[PDB]
Design an enzyme around this catalytic site. Structure first.
Site, mmCIF file in Angstrom:
data_model
loop_
_atom_site.group_PDB
_atom_site.id
_atom_site.type_symbol
_atom_site.label_atom_id
_atom_site.label_comp_id
_atom_site.label_asym_id
_atom_site.label_seq_id
_atom_site.Cartn_x
_atom_site.Cartn_y
_atom_site.Cartn_z
ATOM 1 N N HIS A 185 0.809 -1.241 0.000
ATOM 2 C CA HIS A 185 0.000 0.000 0.000
ATOM 3 C C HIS A 185 0.833 1.277 0.000
ATOM 4 C CE1 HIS A 185 0.170 0.484 4.529
ATOM 5 N NE2 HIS A 185 0.021 1.753 4.188
ATOM 6 N N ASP B 138 -0.914 -7.219 1.978
ATOM 7 C CA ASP B 138 -0.209 -5.947 2.024
ATOM 8 C C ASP B 138 1.302 -6.127 2.227
ATOM 9 O OD1 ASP B 138 -0.393 -2.858 4.002
ATOM 10 O OD2 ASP B 138 0.186 -3.190 1.947
ATOM 11 N N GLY C 63 2.409 6.616 9.164
ATOM 12 C CA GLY C 63 3.788 6.888 8.710
ATOM 13 C C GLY C 63 4.793 5.762 8.984
ATOM 14 N N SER D 93 3.959 2.651 8.257
ATOM 15 C CA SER D 93 3.537 1.659 7.282
ATOM 16 C C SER D 93 4.748 1.085 6.592
ATOM 17 C CB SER D 93 2.669 2.301 6.192
ATOM 18 O OG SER D 93 1.366 2.590 6.650
ATOM 19 N N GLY D 94 4.753 -0.237 6.424
ATOM 20 C CA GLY D 94 5.856 -0.935 5.751
ATOM 21 C C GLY D 94 6.987 -1.378 6.686
#
Ligand SMILES: CCOc1cc(O[C@@H]2CCOC2)c(F)c([C@@H](Nc2ccc(C(=N)N)cc2)C(=O)O)c1
Ligand SMILES: [Ca+2]
Lengths: 53, 254
Positions: free
Chosen positions: B41, B90, B190, B192-193
């Site tokens: 994403h 994801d 922020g 994310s990942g």
């Protein structure tokens, strides 16, 4: 055996036919003669924090 | 990260910062010298794939201290089953243009075998999540890398313990919940990942990816993480493959 307490392995475990299992280690590690422990073979093995080691 | 602490410099050495035109995009996790795991994403809005940079050895974004290593991103590989703008599957595997150099400040996180991850790591209660995301919901992002210890829930327990939101996304087999429902501690958009990292017998392993949630540290909700164990074989196969022209690559899943 691998499903119970990771088969005793420090890292990865495989079951074989019969009362048999083999432990294995990630790249950058080697298996000790206990057949369960993994010791680094390189300076920066994965999953270890140098400043703490 | 909400309700965590600064990760002492060098104690989160697998953390990756992803930038697009110099701006903070997402986190990621180094798993060997050329491969980074992040969230699919993170790439939903990328226009020019050639301005994506990965930074290793980052700590305090306000300064340069010489431990940072930046690389161009040569390939962004996303599972066929991921649909942009939705939650399932994801995950993204990024190939760097040139390997990073392992140092005291740059070290990969171990990508575990699936069986080990499912049988053993999944039952380790607490794991670390990290990033330069928002310090508060609707707040500013962090200048120093933050880390937080979160407990993992079985999905049925997560659903039972969560407040209901008519529209809520399903928590699938490719996800898991971790965190707290008291509004105190969570990862945020922020982050994310970034890594959800699990310790076992002296070594740390990648078990999750910061994926989604209802706000950040919203009372009655937990963080949701991509369940990395589902993707081990998919990742390993791709890491054995030759690069292909064009940054984005959609690859069959399973
Ligand atoms: C596959 C990603 O899906 C996302 C969905 C997001 O919101 C929807 C609407 C309410 O529930 C889900 C979202 F904010 C995000 C947000 N990321 C995010 C990551 C972690 C948390 C958390 N741990 N609370 C929250 C949001 C973002 O990057 O925009 C992502
Ligand atoms: Ca810096």
């Amino acid at each position: 055996i691998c499903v119970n307490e990771n088969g005793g392995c420090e890292q990865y475990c495989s079951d074989h036919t019969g009362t048999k299992r083999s432990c294995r280690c990630h790249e950058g590690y080697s298996l000790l003669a206990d057949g369960v422990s993994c010791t680094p073979t390189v300076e920066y093995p994965c999953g270890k924090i140098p400043i703490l080691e | 990260i909400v309700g965590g602490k600064v990760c002492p410099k060098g104690e989160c050495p697998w953390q990756v910062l992803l930038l697009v035109n110099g701006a903070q995009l997402c986190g990621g996790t180094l798993i060997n010298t050329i491969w980074v795991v992040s969230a699919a994403h993170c790439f939903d809005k990328i226009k020019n794939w050639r301005n994506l940079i990965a930074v290793l050895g980052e700590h305090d974004l306000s300064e340069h201290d010489g431990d940072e290593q930046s690389r161009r991103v040569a390939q962004v590989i996303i599972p066929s089953t991921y649909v942009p703008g939705t939650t399932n599957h994801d995950i993204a595997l990024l190939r760097l243009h040139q390997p990073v150099v392992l140092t005291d400040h740059v070290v990969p996180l171990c990508l575990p075998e699936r069986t080990f991850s499912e049988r053993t790591l999944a039952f380790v209660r607490f794991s670390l999540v990290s990033g330069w995301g928002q310090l508060l919901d609707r707040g500013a992002t962090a200048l120093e890398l933050m880390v937080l210890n979160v407990p993992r829930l079985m999905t049925q327990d997560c659903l039972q313990q969560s407040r209901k939101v008519g529209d809520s996304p399903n928590i699938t087999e490719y996800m898991f919940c971790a965190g707290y429902s008291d509004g105190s501690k969570d990862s945020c958009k922020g982050d994310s990942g970034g890594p959800h990292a699990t310790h076992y017998r002296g070594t740390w392993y990648l078990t999750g990816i910061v994926s989604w949630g209802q706000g950040c540290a919203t009372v009655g909700h937990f963080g949701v993480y991509t369940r990395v164990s589902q993707y081990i074989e998919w990742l390993q196969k791709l890491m054995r493959s030759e690069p292909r022209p064009g940054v984005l690559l959609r690859a069959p899943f399973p």
